[PDB]
Amino acid sequence: PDFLGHAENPLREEEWARLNETVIQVARRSLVGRRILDIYGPLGAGVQTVPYDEFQGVSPGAVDIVGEQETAMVFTDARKFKTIPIIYKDFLLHWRDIEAARTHNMPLDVSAAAGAAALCAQQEDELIFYGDARLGYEGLMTANGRLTVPLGDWTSPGGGFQAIVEATRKLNEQGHFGPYAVVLSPRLYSQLHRIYEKTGVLEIETIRQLASDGVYQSNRLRGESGVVVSTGRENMDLAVSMDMVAAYLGASRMNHPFRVLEALLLRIKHPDAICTL
Amino acid sequence: PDFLGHAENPLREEEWARLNETVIQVARRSLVGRRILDIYGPLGAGVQTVPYDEFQGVSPGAVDIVGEQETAMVFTDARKFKTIPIIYKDFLLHWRDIEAARTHNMPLDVSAAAGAAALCAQQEDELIFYGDARLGYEGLMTANGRLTVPLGDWTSPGGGFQAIVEATRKLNEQGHFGPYAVVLSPRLYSQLHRIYEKTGVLEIETIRQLASDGVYQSNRLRGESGVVVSTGRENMDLAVSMDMVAAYLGASRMNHPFRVLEALLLRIKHPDAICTL
Amino acid sequence: VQTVPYDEFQGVSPGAVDIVGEQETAMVFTDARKFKTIPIIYKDFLLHWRDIEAARTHNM
Amino acid sequence: AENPLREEEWARLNETVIQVARRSLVGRRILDIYGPLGAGVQTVPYDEFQGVSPGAVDIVGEQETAMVFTDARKFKTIPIIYKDFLLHWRDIEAARTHNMPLDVSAAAGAAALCAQQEDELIFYGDARLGYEGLMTANGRLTVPLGDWTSPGGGFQAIVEATRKLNEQGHFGPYAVVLSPRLYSQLHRIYEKTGVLEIETIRQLASDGVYQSNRLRGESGVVVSTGRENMDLAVSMDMVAAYLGASRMNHPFRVLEALLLRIKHPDAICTL
Amino acid sequence: PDFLGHAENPLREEEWARLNETVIQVARRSLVGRRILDIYGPLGAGVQTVPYDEFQGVSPGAVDIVGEQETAMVFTDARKFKTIPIIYKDFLLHWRDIEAARTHNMPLDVSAAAGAAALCAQQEDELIFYGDARLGYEGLMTANGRLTVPLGDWTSPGGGFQAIVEATRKLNEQGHFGPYAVVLSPRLYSQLHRIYEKTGVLEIETIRQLASDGVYQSNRLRGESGVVVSTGRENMDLAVSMDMVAAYLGASRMNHPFRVLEALLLRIKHPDAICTL
After folding, report:
1. Chain E interface mutation, best of A4, A9, A262, highest count of E Cβ atoms under 10 Å
2. Per the CB < 8 Å rule, is C27 touching A112?
3. Eight-state DSSP code of residue C28
4. What is known of its domains (chain C)?
């Protein structure tokens, strides 16, 4: 039973199902990056490299009756073929909870799984919003060509939104408009909620109407920064080799450790739809 | 296989389906003109001319018990029979991604298709909102008899909406009222969002209630213009010979180029439900 | 069941990512088991033995 | 807009390309290839190196010494090398009715150019794209190949190169590649008694001493021929494909997809 | 229902065969010790101890008309058994590489296998040529009774022959002669391999004719030393318990590390057939 040890997999079908459901649910709850990024289809476990494709491109496109104008198609700047990293965390079970949960407490206790999945999602969000320079990866606030805008004039309601207005203007000058989105640091997301005298309407609602794809808040982003993006495809993507899955790590000291895994890579196909501080 | 070259069509059924789905989705995301214009049914590929029908017409219509009042039916001003142009863009595939995507990366990479479809939709929106004078076509801000109204008094909240009020008044004087709509340039759409002191309620909400068919923003329109329209049929239409479809262009240099096509023509059946700057 | 594993008090493992998949971050297991006991919350009410009888003929 | 040639002429074209390849490839006789992976793949894993872990623990039971693995996992993109030529429709018709050679001299020229480009790639990485070159590798163990044009010449340099390989704990059946100038001029037949100096070098190397005119004037290398030290990842062998008729003249393109991955850059010597 | 888990052997049959072939062949390439010596056959895994016979014997045979010599050669006091150590390395193989080699790109890479086995064989040759004091073993250049002889004459055109001549004379002085075999350090071997000795051809040919069992090269020896020995049995031996083979240690974080095993012990049954600097 539990003495032979190093069995292929301890848990049963139902317990695997509960573990996977819990990690999926906590991931969906705590992820902010995956809410404004269209995901690539799940490629598979084997794939380790994806075609990190574009840097630029423009072909205004023309129309005429016959159908002959000879406009060069947008193919690619130059292939780069980045490699897909892996994001993981790990938790533990006490080899008796698995045994108690077959007679006494029928639904197995998996709170450690949620605790691990929250940290995994935090690390993944940090990966999307920031590179690490140990793999040459690129981040939303670290990408080259970010169209920085000096936005420090806050603590006065007579402004603040004008920073995002200027961000939209800069995004428009580069010929790139669409459904915008904003991700802001807590130290400024809270500051937006201010109810200073001569209130009228809070700036958050105006910004929400101006963005039309939701203003989001994420703790992983640094204390004094915020970004504006264009949510569509062909500007950003999310290569997903495999989603949150819980796997086994053998049995150490007769307990049971597990690891939550996913293979994600952010590829920005158009590093022009970016604005920062 | 890939060496015989110049095959009839490289891709398989699934890859064609993904290409078409991607172009449809990006078109629906990036189109603003097709959201306030009821479309004519898809006529077919062969059709190249449509009955660009009306310029005017009025028959107040009367009622009496017997049913005899002899009011002339609205038939047509004069037939014109404009010709349907074609709007297209084109992209490329590297003949190995199509090969890798059958063993390694099961969902084929089609980011270039989205990049092309966005530009195609931009050009189509420019066609609706502006003519080109190389085909004698008519545009929303170029049509003759536009009921222009001097609207430059902005940067002060004590106004701005009154321009649209005057636009509605002018549309009413010509005996044409209904569910209104507004399409505004970014330089003024952002200006509406202003939170100048003595805020109360932002002008955008009041304008939205006044229009009752949504105030929209489009970058293709010029920097200092905006229009008010009546969304119903019998005033505007959209002849659609065929929607976004991706077609093949042979194989050049052993790669694979494709073209996104649609055949669209705007016909304004009543160039009185127009207001501009 | 009358006892449940009242489990944690703390725990942190920032979690790291690398290409190969080897960083050795300690999993969040538990501070120390405590095993609290499940109380019971109850109230009580009354019926007049005729309402139960009336409610089979008069007031369904 | 069609497909030009039938089976016989296609086979003749392919055979000519294969023959010129197998004649002109010098790298394929010194490095063994990772099996043809198909046209699908475009990336491959890469080297492991300076795994300094003696592993000589030599204790009953066992210690916990460090395992050997890739020093830094990363990938490389397999290039594509191609040459394009042309054929005339009237030429095909003539070869179909009047005479029947179907001249394929252009195909032979294309294959020769492709093979020369490939060999230059193996012996010199493309600096612009950025790869690893046998004479430009990092950690090359340079040895002065000078003071030649002497009675005791190339032998004194090859023995030094072999002792530098062996000192680095990397030995086996070696192979040598020399520039044509030396590989001809090295025939200083008199070592002392009767045996060609190149012959005694070949006895010392035991896996041939080849020449490749692509090298520079006064350069040459010696390597360890086994696998797990050097490799040649192939995606598809040299083959001719059709680019589609244009203006009724049929173009063509000969393709090859190669990339060498020097796993253990300790088997190198140069000038 | 997939690769995840702490299961038993991940590698399929043919993959195991390729791993075993690789380790065997790289061992055969990298072993110099097991050519000068000769091995007591494979005893098996279980045998942890082997006899270690006492020391020299100056007792020769004799011939008489009627056998009465009694030809005694008897071990005196004990037998001082010894134990057979083990040598090993690591095989950190990624799980994604194994996964790719199943339904995708499939040249299963075992470069780490060859590297680790080469390191293991290098350590083993270091063991034969140099004992380690921690286990209290004896090495050929650090045994007792090496019959030292100075060299002090190389770097000359022909000052290498007389060194081995003197070594052979000293080795025959102890009444211990036979087919000699020489092992030399790298730089010493190359220097010996120099130009004609001014009295014929390359010195190594004469040295090889004099030795009658070859002159071998060992990088693992120190800078400026070398040995000559008597290749026969009844003088030296290499007790083998089990030859090089790769076995599965366990499951790492998610990878699979292996370990290469071989159990060898040298027995200098007659420390008279050793000569050094």
Report:
1. A9
2. yes
3. B
4. Has 3 domains; a discontinuous peripheral domain (P), an elongated loop (E) and the discontinuous axial domain (A).
